[PDB]
Subunit: 345 residues, 3 copies
Amino acid sequence: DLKLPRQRVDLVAPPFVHVHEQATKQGPKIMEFKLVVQEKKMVIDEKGTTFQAMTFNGSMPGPLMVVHEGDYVEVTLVNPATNTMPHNIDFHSATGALGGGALTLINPGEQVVLRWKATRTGVFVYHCAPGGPMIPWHVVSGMNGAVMVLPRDGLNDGHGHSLRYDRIYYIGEQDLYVPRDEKGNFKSYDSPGEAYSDTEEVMRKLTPTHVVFNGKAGALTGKNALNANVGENVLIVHSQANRDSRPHLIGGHGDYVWETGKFSNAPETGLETWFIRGGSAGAALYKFLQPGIYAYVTHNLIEAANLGATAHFKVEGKWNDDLMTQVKAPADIPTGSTNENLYFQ
Amino acid sequence: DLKLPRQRVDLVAPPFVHVHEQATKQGPKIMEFKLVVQEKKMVIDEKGTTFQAMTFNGSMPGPLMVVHEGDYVEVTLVNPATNTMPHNIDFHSATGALGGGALTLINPGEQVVLRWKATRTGVFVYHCAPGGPMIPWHVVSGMNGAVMVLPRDGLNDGHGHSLRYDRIYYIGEQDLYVPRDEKGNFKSYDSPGEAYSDTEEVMRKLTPTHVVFNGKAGALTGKNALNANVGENVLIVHSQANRDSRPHLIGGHGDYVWETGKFSNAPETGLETWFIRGGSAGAALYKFLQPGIYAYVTHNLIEAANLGATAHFKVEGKWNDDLMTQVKAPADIPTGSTNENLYFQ
Amino acid sequence: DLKLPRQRVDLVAPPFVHVHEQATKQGPKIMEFKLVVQEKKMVIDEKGTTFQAMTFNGSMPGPLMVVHEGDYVEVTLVNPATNTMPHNIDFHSATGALGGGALTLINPGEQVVLRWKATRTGVFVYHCAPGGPMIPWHVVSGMNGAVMVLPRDGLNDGHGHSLRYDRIYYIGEQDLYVPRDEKGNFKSYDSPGEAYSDTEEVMRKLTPTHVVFNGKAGALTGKNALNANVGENVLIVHSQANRDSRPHLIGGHGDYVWETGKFSNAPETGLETWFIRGGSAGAALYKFLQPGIYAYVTHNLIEAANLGATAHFKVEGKWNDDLMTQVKAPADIPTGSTNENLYFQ
Ligand SMILES: [Cu+2]
Ligand SMILES: [Cu+2]
Ligand SMILES: [Cu+2]
Ligand SMILES: [Cu+2]
Ligand SMILES: [Cu+2]
Ligand SMILES: [Cu+2]
């Protein structure tokens, strides 16, 4: 007997986001989304390591859902008969029944329809959580995404000023636990079930083998770099359903950062590095001031450079020599420079 | 020559809390507490693994002490002659002498009386800290608790509105470092001293074998679930004296969260997951809106499900279908559903 | 064509800081700094373990640079011909070209001059970042420091009150990854290049062998303790370029803490323990109220006591028995004390 208008949303693969309004004058709606569970082998690194992944909608992360405060979110969760395990969904945005997990457990060949009222603003994790040890294993197998619940008036700076983004990207970070053989090579498996025992042993020691954005090392570099232009205000939503992260935009800042990810809280200003606690989503606005390549990392630089957790932005525009300039290009060290007379010698 | 009234406090075992007022019109008092050190073997997991524990008042965590701003806290620390090691106490709430550690070192058969003025509001860790390597070892052996210093006016939302809790629970999280034999079995020892060398080796690699609430895996599940009712505002104090945590109430939120734990700072609103930095206590208020089981975890879900760090709430009340409802129970996937035509196939 | 006055800054070795003003009436200047890369073997622990370090200005951390909002910072980066590797510098305070890394890559025998406008207030990390796996390896080899960009009006409490420090100390925390032989002994190498392969293997498992302040275990204890006096307001700048930390002043508090480190954000008040996300600098003011030894730690107490991460303050002044006093010195436990009748027995 919820007599509200219904609006179907077509989800898009991360790091892109389905079309939505920021500020709206539309009243509350039943926002209809479909998530289809896909268990499949995926490539996770640049050497071609494969992985028995479990996904919402075939991606790591699952897609970003966007609704407004006071909307109702009606999610059809589908578990195709080609899958081997039960699945469900827990929305950190939702109230009751373990986030909906206690209402969405489906076997292969089943679907279920959950509605939750979007009473809490912010970016939130959603993840599979079937029970017991299956909870971490489904989540670190890739079954996690995020949902953004925007204020109807859109974002503000917590000091009565509207904030509008020109562009939005969703960065889902995934810790992966890939078994190795005696020789230190990553092991391949024919099913998630066959990988489980060896994978739980790696999981137990809490140290990922891979930490990736958008499902694989290099996913958001080279050809798949994130585009932007000088002057654009870009919202960067970052989620980590299992493990902490410390995002940093190399050559940039977080102009406005909700590191705990909830828009009822004023953002922090001018951050270098922020913190996404495992089990949450956060968000950072930045207005690009300079063109060129930016690397977006977790600033555990070992994770960023050696375990997969670097994305790139390619920003078009004119260089601003006032903000930064190379005064003198690399040149031989004079004489007659008196390095040798310095304090620390 | 402190001529204030004296009030003796009877401590209770966590996760319960001794009777106290929130707002008070009482003036500053000397609040008298007794903590008795108990070294003893304890069971820490559901397979019956034992552990040479060191405790305040026989529990992990030690009990929650509750006082008001400007009270004086007079702690009798007792180290019974049946114990084998010196102990002391460091109050993160206190000013001077390493939190009182430099004034409370006692051998077995000794007691000492420390007074500290409650000048700082919030929830704080207290822990043993005898010196050198004994500091981490006493703390990760279980010698840590918390103290709450309430404003005399009780809690507020940082925006001039009173916040009152119906119910308070203290969740002490403990990282444990249990040696394993060649075969991967947990080792048993006859004394804390005999366990030390092997335990320090595990401690050095920074990866707990167990992460538990109230001293053991399963301590706050099944029969020992935390009770609440729909409409109750519940304060959840969480401490971790050694290692970070990211609390999350599955199916709930943090309405008001002091993740750094200090009531001179406005809480954040509507959090999904918060962050307890090792060496601190934090606190979250939540008003239950839905009945049923809630799991309260660290949202490193590997820690939560596989290393012990899950508690349950059992909440009585009437389900609210407006906040969340199962629109359609699990059913076979139509035909004629066109899964196969979806974008990500 | 930047026609501003030029001011040369003489850097000093951490934990000291070069002379500067807090509030200034000086207009924007070109602030000239020189950083000289020094690759050298350094001692990192109390057992004399050596390490193939890479440094700015021969120290871990590199020195603290201090400027004011709207200054321009003109950095001459020097890579002497006695070094073996290329180096560069990334300023988290700077906008564009990967923080300046994309404008400062120099071979041994070269120098380069970078200018960046100090548009963002706070404490920021600077670090070497040559590209790819060399980024973490240069950073965890010691090539990181910090820069403080003060408001021209100096610090404030975010509530319109000026905050002034009597004394400033820069604590650079360094995670180190030292290979071990079959026997568990730390390995020595003749060059950074020869250490690389074995070091990357340790780095990959994300668990430091050492966590140190000012480059070595014990660097800021005993003779090299940090001095202060009762009544002094001390600013403690803490940086970690690669890995999280949770600073705590044992026997003290953070009166005013910018844990994300950016002065456009009001500090938090009265913290026990704060959080420095890897890849950032934060800062805490404290007014000493009590004399004596204070230990300043990361409150992973295993790291603090067993991997090197403890500093000391030695504070001169008169003890305040009102804040804390030993009511009764250690004494035998009465009879007739009824320990045995207590709840937890
Ligand atoms: Cu699943
Ligand atoms: Cu969750
Ligand atoms: Cu002890
Ligand atoms: Cu402590
Ligand atoms: Cu370098
Ligand atoms: Cu960086």
